[PDB]
Design a protein around this ligand. Structure first.
Ligand SMILES: C=CCc1ccccc1O
Length: 175
């Protein structure tokens, strides 16, 4: 590692991580499963009706957006969604002990997973939870690679799986 490469971990954090996996879009779009999304991975609704999505949008931003937001508004919604995922882990009796056992980088991958799937989705991975607590990283990653979450949209999930395997930021290098 060069002096610069050793600096790369101090530049990575949950916000930079999710920003890479989710992208940044200032107009309403459909994500890889066809669900209306905006900003940095903010799922607006699962309904096929673009009208619900715009209404959810104006609600979340608090103005008449007509489907378009600013970078600063994107950042704000994103920070709220990150806070919600972390809070969702910490209050949950099953996820909190596993999260507490993890190192800082794998904790970021855990918050990313919850941001993407939701609390009950993640807490259903009974086996992967036990694997992670037992530091069985290879097995946890192979089992996450069996999931619909990863297989229906691999490019959004692949870096998170690699990060559970390694506990480093290497999958976020060299975009
Ligand atoms: C079970 C998969 C990973 C994971 C671990 C701990 C907390 C949340 C989370 O998504």
């Amino acid at each position: 590692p060069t002096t610069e490469n050793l600096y790369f971990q101090g530049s990575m954090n949950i916000f930079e991580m999710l920003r890479i996996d989710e992208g940044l879009r200032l107009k309403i779009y459909k994500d890889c499963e066809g669900y209306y999304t905006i900003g940095i991975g903010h799922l607006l609704t699962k309904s096929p009706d673009l009208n619900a999505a715009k209404s959810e949008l104006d609600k979340a931003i608090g103005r008449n957006c007509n489907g378009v937001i600013t970078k600063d508004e994107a950042e704000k919604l994103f920070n709220q969604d990150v806070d919600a995922a972390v809070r969702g882990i910490l209050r949950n009796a099953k996820l909190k002990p596993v999260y507490d056992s993890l190192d800082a980088v794998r904790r970021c991958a855990a918050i990313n997973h919850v941001f993407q799937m939701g609390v009950t989705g993640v807490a259903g991975f009974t086996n992967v939870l036990r694997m992670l607590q037992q530091k069985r990283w290879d097995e946890a990653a192979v089992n996450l690679a069996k999931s619909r979450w990863y297989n229906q949209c691999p490019d959004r999930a692949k870096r998170v799986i690699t990060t559970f395997r390694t506990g480093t930021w290497d999958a976020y290098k060299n975009l």
